Ligand SMILES: Nc1ncnc2c1ncn2[C@@H]1O[C@H](COP(=O)(O)OP(=O)(O)OP(=O)(O)O)[C@@H](O)[C@H]1O
Ligand SMILES: Nc1ncnc2c1ncn2[C@@H]1O[C@H](COP(=O)(O)OP(=O)(O)OP(=O)(O)O)[C@@H](O)[C@H]1O
């Protein structure tokens with residue numbers, strides 16, 4: 001807190017900056033807990049205030065119920081609330097939220113199958129397609145096709161994608177069968 | 185030889201990639217032509233046949249030719265998609281996984297959520313030597329190696345990324361390397377990266393647009409077994425034109441609200457069905473023959489089906505389609521029943537649907 | 547030409563009542579609500595035609611028996627024994643029917659296709675009668691709103707910033723009535739003309 | 740109307756600071772200035788945490804600033820909330 | 836349109852002074868400056 005205050009009140013100070021990177025680790029550890037606000041101080045002058053925020057407080061604030069409460073409060077004050085009572089409403093909301101947070105902390109006492117089946121179907125059907133492409137008979141087809149033809153190239157070129165489409169159809173059918181097996 | 189075949193195959197790939205969109209339009213046009221011809225079937229009589237009532241007599245060969253052409257065009261559209269759009273999908277997936285590796289350590293420090301199909305499937309492409317084939321950054325493995333190797337283990341990081349340990353310094357010291365002939369078929373089969381192609385095929389199969397085009401192809405094939413399957417290709421107009429997409433956005437923008445409104449209507453009609461089944465059973469005789477009654481509310485399921493199917497579709501609600509309450513001791517209660525059904529179901533909920541559509545427009 | 551033809555047949559003078567769309571701007575305000583989204587209206591009509599064609603295909607393949615529209619028990623009048631006849635029947639009758647095609651075809655109770663035909667009728671009512679017509683009304687209402695918004699935008703621009711120089715009224719209003727003085731004496735577009 | 744109310748809430752929150760009311764145009768002279776101000780300098784969550792901290796802290800252990808804010812809170816006087824002013828506006832000459 | 840007219844009236848009254856027409860941004864440099872100006876300095880009720 002001392003180092004942060006010094007840094008914020010002397011932004012341009014090389015020695016203090018050097019001390020900052022010297023103390024970088026501690027500041028990084030204490031960053032979630034160091035809370036800053038600004039107030040209209042007793043000297044008729046805006047002042048920075050540094051304080052401590054507890055881990056329990058941050059967790060209770062980040063609970064989704066409190067998030068929904070904050071959203072509703074903001075909606076209310078923006079729409080149906082004026083500017084003269086805005087801070088009074090904000091303080092009332094803060095008090096109610098703080099009580100709810102403390103009560104929640106007090107009472108806090110102390111698809112996978114589908115994804116796996118889809119991955120298995122993908123692996124199996126693609127390995128079948130790879131087995132089809134890579135064979136010891138591929139050398140035999142190649143020795144047969146030592147002679148090129150434009151028509152032969154067109155036929156093989158089309159057949160590769162026809163095999164890809166058939167493999168996709170097999171994969172989709174496997175997906176439906178596996179889904180039915182797991183749901184039943 | 186293989187150089188020539190690669191050149192001609194590249195020509196063919198580029199031609200299909202250039203003409204991917206023109207032929208989607210051509211397939212849609214052929215689908216309209218097929219369905220316009222389909223408007224000229226009739227049933228003729230055992231087994232009944234579907235026969236063209238053609239005055240000219242030319243329409244049956246035209247239909248056969250158009251069906252064959254539509255199937256061919258759908259196949260070529262799949263090919264054009266694979267040449268044109270698949271490279272961008274692979275590029276984006278490789279970019280995503282590379283950035284997640286370097287800037288998040290998704291496999292070094294974190295792990296996939298085990299319910300994420302993409303995160304679990306992307307494990308395969310990391311080990312592949314040709315991992316960033318489409319993504320420009322060819323140094324992602326080295327960047328991850330420098331970021332995490334010293335702290336997380338320079339051996340396991342290399343094993344995870346599929347980087348050779350001693351090949352680098354052996355080659356730097358004394359390479360002792362020889363050229364390989366491209367004509368060797370076994371050499372080419374070793375050169376092709378099997379695991380990377382497996383991962384790429386998985387990505388393509390998971391891709392939504394490719395699945396849509398495959399469904400289009402399957403429907404085109406089934407159109408030869410039954411010509412009326414070509415009507416399913418008229419659904420392609422929701423994707424062919426942006427002007428129709430503007431209209432359909434007014435429906436899909438608040439689609440979840442529309443579905444929830446339908447469910448709420450179902451619940452309200454169920455409550456009305458409960459009330460009718462408990463109090464107004466006598467009024468649900470829907471038989472004109474005075475001898476045999478046809479009671480639609482003697483069973484809860486029958487009463488709910490009757491309400492949902494008839495009262496909702498009726499202009500004035502359920503009161504239009506059930507026996508008049510005049511003179512009955514439950515007359516006032518049943519009048520309230522009918523009026524409230526009309527006001528809540530016919531007037532308000534349908535108004536909610538229209539309001540959702542109009543608000544989507546706005 | 548219509549006025550001349552009115553002498554051969556006096557009812558051709560009814561075509562001159564179409565001149566009200568051009569005589570009055572007040573009727574033009576109303577008709578803009580239709581013509582503003584006219585292309586969307588036409589495309590919606592076409593989409594309705596396509597959806598009804600799909601429903602016709604389904605009925606022609608599965609629900610032919612339910613389309614007997616003859617009261618005389620001797621001679622049937624099947625409206626779905628031909629694809630063109632079934633499509634005309636659907637487009638002409640089911641679309642105009644309050645509850646959809648289910649109002650005008652034989653009741654499905656007791657049939658083995660009862661659940662499928664109930665789904666057919668309910669989905670026809672929901673998609674054709676409820677949604678697409680709602681799309682038409684929404685297009686008209688949105689045209690009303692868009693024309694209104696355009697008018698208020700024109701008014702807001704003219705009242706806020708000068709037409710010629712584009713400087714807002716905030717700068718000119720440091721002098722009392724400064725904006726109106728600038729826009730009526732210094733930068734008047736009428737003066738420029 | 741419900742839609743318009745929601746977009747109005749969003750527009751207000753994105754344009755001007757909730758506490759001081761200064762628009763994002765002033766703060767955005769520094770890159771990411773508005774988000775820095777609304778997440779580090781004038782965070783309403785931070786103000787709620789400060790009220791919690793003051794309430795939980797012993798009265799005899801308050802610092803001068805804490806005692807000032809605590810007294811003002813006890814009389815429910817909200818002048819300590821920065822209204823139309825901030826650290827940056829106060830120290831424009833020295834900070835810039 | 837009636838809704839929009841009502842919110843326009845509300846927006847105008849909350850943003851700028853009825854008499855002088857100066858927006859609330861100038862007056863709010865002082866805390867509660869706009870309400871002070873519109874209730875103590877330029878009140879239309881006071882003018883009446
Ligand atoms: N360059 C400009 N010349 C004239 N008016 C301008 C110019 N820039 C802004 N304005 C504004 O446009 C408005 C003029 O409105 P408009 O064109 O309807 O004419 P008018 O004087 O109100 O009368 P009329 O309705 O009979 O034409 C005024 O509010 C004026 O301040
Ligand atoms: N005093 C303030 N404190 C916090 N946010 C403020 C403040 N003034 C304005 N804002 C703005 O309000 C927005 C915060 O939105 P919101 O309250 O929804 O929280 P969030 O951080 O976006 O997340 P969440 O939706 O999970 O609550 C930001 O755009 C922020 O700039």
Ligand SMILES: Nc1ncnc2c1ncn2[C@@H]1O[C@H](COP(=O)(O)OP(=O)(O)OP(=O)(O)O)[C@@H](O)[C@H]1O
Nearest residue numbers: 848849851852853854869870873874877878879880
């Ligand atoms: N010259 C002005 N005189 C008074 N109020 C003004 C003036 N200019 C702007 N305003 C604003 O108009 C609003 C006054 O609203 P309104 O006329 O409804 O009265 P009110 O005090 O809110 O109460 P009531 O609704 O009971 O009349 C305030 O927000 C005020 O800041």
Ligand SMILES: [Zn+2]
Nearest residue numbers: 708710711733
């Ligand atoms: Zn000007």
Ligand SMILES: [Zn+2]
Nearest residue numbers: 756758759781
């Ligand atoms: Zn602020």
Ligand SMILES: [Zn+2]
Nearest residue numbers: 852854855877
């Ligand atoms: Zn004033």
